[PDB]
């Protein structure tokens, strides 16, 4: 009944400013954030196949995990994902994509 059991994943930083999560029972490390540590925001973002990162000039690109495609402009799908604070569901739930 581990409903109130502390996670075995802890947070640490490397000399490069990077973060690595350690599992204190299995003794295994990862660069990926385990879904048990993911903050609500991350949980929200984590289901979005489109994610924001910046290029060398600071000009943003948005990448899709399913289709593996890259675009310069923000798709509306991500736009509504950001607005997950006012009108949580933008008239539809993310269970029907027309790509």
């Amino acid at each position: 009944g581990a409903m109130g059991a502390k996670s075995m994943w802890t947070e640490h930083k490397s000399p490069d400013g990077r973060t690595y999560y350690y599992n204190t029972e299995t003794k295994q490390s990862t660069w990926e954030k385990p879904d048990d540590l993911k903050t609500p925001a991350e949980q929200l973002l984590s289901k979005c196949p489109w994610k924001e990162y910046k290029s060398d000039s600071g000009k943003p690109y948005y990448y899709n995990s399913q289709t593996k495609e890259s675009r310069w402009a923000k798709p509306k799908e991500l736009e509504d994902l950001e607005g997950y604070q006012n009108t949580i569901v933008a008239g539809s739930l993310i269970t029907k994509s027309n790509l």
Partner: peptide
């Protein structure tokens, strides 16, 4: 080893270089 200090760093690396942006074709 590495029982003192900080625990070990994992194999692999989280995408250091940005995945390819469209260079110009149909975008």
């Amino acid at each position: 080893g590495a029982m003192s200090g900080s625990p070990p760093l994992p194999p692999g690396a989280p995408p250091p270089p940005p995945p390819p942006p469209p260079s110009g074709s149909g975008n």
